[model samples]
Target: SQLVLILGDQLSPSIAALDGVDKKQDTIVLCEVMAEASYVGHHKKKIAFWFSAMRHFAEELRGEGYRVRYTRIDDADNAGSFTGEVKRAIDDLTPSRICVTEPGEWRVRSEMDGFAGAFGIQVDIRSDRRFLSSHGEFRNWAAGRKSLTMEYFYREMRRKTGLLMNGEQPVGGRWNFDAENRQPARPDLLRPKHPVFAPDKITKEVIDTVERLFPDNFGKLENFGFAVTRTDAERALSAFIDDFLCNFGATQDAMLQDDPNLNHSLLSFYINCGLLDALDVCKAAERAYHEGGAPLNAVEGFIRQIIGWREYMRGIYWLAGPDYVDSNFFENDRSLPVFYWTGKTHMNCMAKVITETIENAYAHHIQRLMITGNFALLAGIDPKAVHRWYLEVYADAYEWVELPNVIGMSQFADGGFLGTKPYAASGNYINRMSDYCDTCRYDPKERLGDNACPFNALYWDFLARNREKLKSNHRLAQPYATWARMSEDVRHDLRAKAAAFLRKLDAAALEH
Candidate 1:
C-alpha cells in the first residue's frame, strides 16, 4: 500500500503518480488548502476552478475502486499546505511509499524534493509526461547555444513531434505559417460563440467556498465559465476544433472592444490543468487539416503554440535555474501601476485587457503581449512585480509558464535570453492590431502633446533609456538609427512627455 498525491492541476489518470500502483490498496490524497490558492492572491475563479476540478476528480477516483483521502477547504482538519497536508496524511496512514508527479513550479518542486527524507519514506517524484519535452531533453538542446530563440527550438519541436511535417519536409514548405496568421480581426457578430460551462452542484459548492473565503480576490465569480471536469474539458476541445480553430491563427494576435475571446481557443486553462492533453489537442487540430475542417496555417500555428511556445516556456523556466526570477537585465524597479489591479486607466487597451482579466481571469496572447505587457515594457514596470501580477490574475498562470513569459518574453528582463529583441512596440502597433485605440482619448499618431498616446512617448523613452544596453543588437538597429536621426528637441520632448505620463500614472496610483 502506498500514498499517491495528486495535485489540483493533475486531474488525469495518465498522471505518472498512478503508475504501478494498485488502486484497491493505494490511497490517493487530494486536498483543497489555503496555502496554494492564496499563495499569490489568486483570482477567485481560479481557486473555484481548481477546487471544483479536484472534487470532481476525487469522485472519479472513487468510481474506479480507489480509496481516496480528499480534504475539502472548509474541513476543520485541513492542514493548510501541501507539506502540512502530506504530513497529516502520514500521521494517519503507514504507507510503504509516497508518489507524485513533479510539480509545475520551482517552489513546489523544491518542497517535493524534501518530502522523502523528512517523512522517512520512499518517495517517487516522476517527470510529467504530459509535456512534449523533458527538463533534461531541453537542457541538452540548450547546452552550448549562445541563443535559445524560440523559433529554432520551435522548429526542432516540429521535427521531433512530426507535426505539420511530411517526412523530412514541412507540409507548408515553411516551418511557420505565422505570417498568414497575423491578419487583424474585424467585428463579426455571426462568429461561433466561445464555449462556457455553467457550474454543477460540485462546482457551485466550490464557488460558494471560494466566495466565502476570498471575497476580495481578483475576478468576478458571477458568470464563471471555466470547464471543471474532464468531460466538459473534452467538450471544450471539440468545440474549439469545430468552431474556433479555423480562424484561430488569423485572429490569434487580434483583439476587439466587445469580444474577449476573438476566435482564440480558450483551451489553455484545460491544457495547463491536465484536464486536456497538449499534444492530443494539437493532433486533433492536425486531423482537422487533413479532413478539410481547418486550414494548414491555422493548424500549424495552433500546434506551434502548444508544442513550441508552451514547451519552450516550461523548458526555459526550469533550465534557467531558480535565480531566473531575479534576471532583470534592465534593472527596472518601478512599481506596477495601480490601474493594473483596478482596470480604471484612461488607456483603453490597458483598461480593456485588465477589465476583462478582472471579469474572466483570462486574456488572449496578444492582449497579454502587445496590449498589457507592451504597456508594462514601455512603462518600465519591475519585471518581478509584472511576473507576480500575471501569476495572480490569470487562471492558467503557473510560475513555470508565466515567469519566462514575463521576464524573458514580455518584459525582456532576462536580457535576450529567450528572445533576441524585445516585443516592445508603440501605439501604432496596437492601433493596427486592435480596435482599442478607436475609443482612446489620446492620438495614436502623436509622440508629444497633451493628448498624445503615452505608448508613442514611452516607446522612444524605453529605447533611449536602454540604448546603452540595446543599441548594439542588429534587430534594434533600425529603431536605434531612427532615434539617432531625431533632433535633440524631439528626443527631449518625447522623454518629457513620457515622464509626464509616468508622473500622472504614479499620482493616479496613489488614489487606489
Candidate 2:
C-alpha cells in the first residue's frame, strides 16, 4: 500500500502525483490544520474557501471510490500541523511508501525534503505539471540573461503552447494588443457581475468551523460567495466567456467607481486554487477567438495573462532563491500606514481600493499594481510589510505568485529583476486612469499648499530621493528633465511639502 498526500491547493484530479493511483492499494490524505491557515493570519474568506474546497474535493475522490483520509480542524487528537498529520497518516495507513506532488512554497518543499530520510521509506515527490514551464526550463531560459523580461518569456510560451499562433507566427500579425486595451471605461458600460455560489452542506460546515476556529482573523466568513467545486468553477468560466470576453481586453486596465469587475474574468482565485486549470482556460479563450465568439484583442489579452504573467510570476519566484522575500534593493524601511490595515485613508483612491479589498478579498490587477502598489512605491513603504499584507488579504495570494508580484514587480525590491523600472506615478496618472480623484477631497492638479494630493508630493520626493539610483534609467529622463526645469524655489517647496506630509503620516502612526 502507498500513501498519497494532497495539499489544499493541489486539488486537481489530473495531478501528476496521482498517476496510476489505485483505489484499493493507495490511500489519499487531506487535512485542515491550524498551521496552514494561521501561517500568516490568512483572510477568513481564504481559510473558508480553501477548507471547504478541500472538503468537497475529498468527497469527489470518495465518490470515485478512492480511499480518502480527511482530517477536520476540530478532530480530537488532531496533530495541528502538516508534518505531524503526515506522520499520523503514515502510521495509520502502514504504507510502504509516500507519494505527493511538489508543494508550492519553498518552506513546505524543505519540510518534505527531510521526510524520506526521517521515515527510511521511499517518498516519491513528483513534479507539478499544471504549469506550462518546468523549473529547469525557466532556469535554462533565464541563464546568461542580464535582465529577464516577461515579454521574452511570454513569446516562448506562446510558441511552445501554440496559443495565439498561426503556424510559426502570431495569428493577429502582432504579439501584443496591450496598447488597444487601455481605454478608460465609462460609467454606463455593460458590466457583468461575478458568478456566485451558495455554500453546499460541505462548504457550510467548513464555514462554521473556520468561524469558530479563526474568529480573530481578518475578513468575514459569512456571505462566502466562491465556487467550491470544479463544476461550479467551470460554469463561472463559461459565464465569463459567453457574456463578457468581448469587452475584456478593451477595458481590462480601466477602473470604475460603480464597478469593481468590469468585463474582467474573476477566475484567478479558481485558477490559482486548482479548481480551474490554467492551460484549459487559455485554450478555451483561444477557441473562442477561432469561433468568432471573442475578438482577437480580448482573447489574446486574456490568454496572455494566463500563459504570460501568471507563469512569469511563478518562474521568477523559483528562479530567485528563498532570499527573494528578503530583497530590499531600494532599502525602504517605513512602516505600512495605519490606513492600509483599516481602509480609513483620506485619499479617495487608496481608501476605495483598500475598502474594496477588505470587503471582497480581491482587487483587479491594475487596482493592485497602479493604485495601491504605486502609492507604496512612491511613499517608500517597506516592501516586506507590503508583501505580508498582500499575502494575507487576497484569496489568490500564494507565495509562488504573490512574492514576486509584491516584491519584484510592485515594490521593485528585486531592483529590475521583475520589472525594468519602478512603477511610481503621481496623482495625475491616477486621475487619468481612475475616477477616484473626481470625488476626492484633495486636488490632483496641486503639488503644494493645503488640500494637495499626497501622491503629487510623494512622487516628486521619490524621484528626488532616488536620483543616484534612477538617473541612469533612460525611461525616467523626461521626468528628471521636467524636475530640473522647475525653479529652485519650486523644487525646494515641493520637497518641503512632501516632508511635511510624510511627517504628519508619521505622527498619525503613533496614534495607531
Candidate 3:
C-alpha cells in the first residue's frame, strides 16, 4: 500500500504521482493545516478559496474510486505542520511508499524530501507536468541566457508551442501587442464589462469553514463567490472568453473606482490552483484567433501573458531560491499601512482596490501592480510585510507565482528579475490609466500642495531615495538625469514637499 500527498495547488489529473495511482490500492492524503494559512496571516478569502478548492479536488479523487484520507479543518486530532500530520498518517496506515507531485514552493519541497529521508521510505517526488514549461525545460531554455527577458522566453514558447506563430514568424508580424494593449481611459465608456462566477454549494461550505477556522484573519468572507471546483472554474473561463476577452486587451490597464472586475482576466486563482490548465486556456485563445472571434492582437496578447510572463515568474521564483524573498532593492522598512486590512481609507483608488480585495480575494493585475503595489513601493513598506500581504490577500496567490511578481517585479526587491526597469511612475500614469484622480480629493497634476496627490510627491521621493543605487543603471539614467537638470530651488521645493508629504502620510492609508 502507498500514500499519495496532494497539495492544495497541485490538483491536476495528469500529474506524475497519478501515474503510480492504483485507485483501489492507494490512499490519498489532503489536509487544511494551520501551518499553511497562519504562516503569513493569509486573507480570509484566500484561505477559503484554497480550502474550498481542495475539498472539491478531494471529492473529485474520491469519485474516481481512490481512497481519500481527507482531513477537515476542524478535525480534533489535527497537527499544524505537514511533517507532524504526515508522520501521524504514516504511523496509522504504515504505508510502504510515499508518492507525491513536487510542490511549487521550495520550502515544502525541502520538508517533504527531508521527511522521506528521516522516515526511511522510498519517497518518489514526481515532476510537475501541468505547466507549459517544465523545470527542466525552463532550465534548458535559460542555460546560456545572461539576460532572461520574458519577451525572449515568450517568443520561444510561442515558437515551441506554435502559438501565435506562422511558420518562421509570429502571426501578426509582432511577438507582442503591448503597444496596442495600452489604451487611454475613455470618459464615455469608463468601465468595460467584467465577468463574474456565481458560487455553488461547495463554495459556500468552504466559506463557512474559513469563517470557523480563521475568524481573526484579514478580509471578509461574505463576497466569497469564487469558483471552487473544477466545473465552476470551466464555467468561469467560458464566460471570460465570451464576455471579457473581446475588450480585455484594450482596457487591461484601466481601472475605475466603481468596477471591481473591469476587463481583467480573473483566471488567476483557477490557473494557480490547477483547476484550469494553462495549455487548455491558451489553446482556447488560439481558437478564438482562428475563428476570428477576437482580434489576433487581443487573443495573442492574452495567450502570451498566461503562457509566457506567468510561467517565467514561476521559474524565477524557483531558480532564485529563498534569498530572492529578501532582495530588498530599496531597503524599505516601514510597516504595511493598517488600512490594507480594513480598506477604510480616504484615497479613492487605494480605497477601491484594497477594500475590494478585502471583500473579495481578487484584484485585476493592473490594480495589483500599478495601484496597490505602487503605493507599497512609494511608501517603503517592509518587503517581507509587502510579500506577506500579497501572499495572504489574493485568492490566486501561491508563493511560486505571486512572490516574484510582488517582491521582484512590484516591490523591486529582487533587484530586477521579471523587469529590467523599476515599474515606477508619477501621478500622470495613474491619471492616464484610470479615472481615480477625477473624483478623488487629491490633484494628480500637482507635484506638491495641500491637495497634491501623494503619488506625485512619493514618486520624486522614491526616485531621489534610490538614486544613489539606481542612477548608474542604463534604463534609470534618463529619469535621474531629468531630475538632476531641474532648477536647484525647484528641486529643493519638490524635495521639501516630498519630505513633508511623507511625514504627514496617514498611518492606515496611502495619502490621496
- TM-scores for all predictions: 0.97, 0.97, 0.94
lDDT-best of 2 and 3: 2
The root-mean-square deviation over C-alpha atoms between each candidate and the true structure, in angstroms, is 1.4, 1.4, 2.6
| lDDT string, candidate 2, 112-188, tens digits | 88889878889999999999899999999999576788888999999999998889999979999988898887775
Q: For residues 1-512, what per-residue lDDT tens digits would candidate 3 score against the true structure?
A: 88888887888776678886878878889987756566536887787777778888888988888898988777888887788878888998799999898998888898998976788888998888876687777788788787778888888778788887889898878778878888865643544455455667877777787788778888887755777778878888888887777777887787876676766668888988789999889988788778877887789789988878887887887778877888887787778887787777667789888888878788888888999899888888788888888888888888888888888778888777665568788888998899888888888989867888888878877888888877877877887888889998878888888778656554324544
**lDDT of candidates 1 onward, in order:** 0.88, 0.88, 0.81
RMSD in angstroms between candidate 2 and the native structure over all alpha carbons: 1.4
Candidate 1: RMSD to truth: 1.4
The CA root-mean-square deviation of candidate 3, after full C-alpha superposition on the true structure, stands at 2.6
lDDT for model 2: 0.88
Off by over 4 Å in 2: 36-41
Task: Assess candidate 3 and give its lDDT.
Answer: 0.81
Cα lDDT over the full model 1: 0.88
TM-score of 3: 0.94
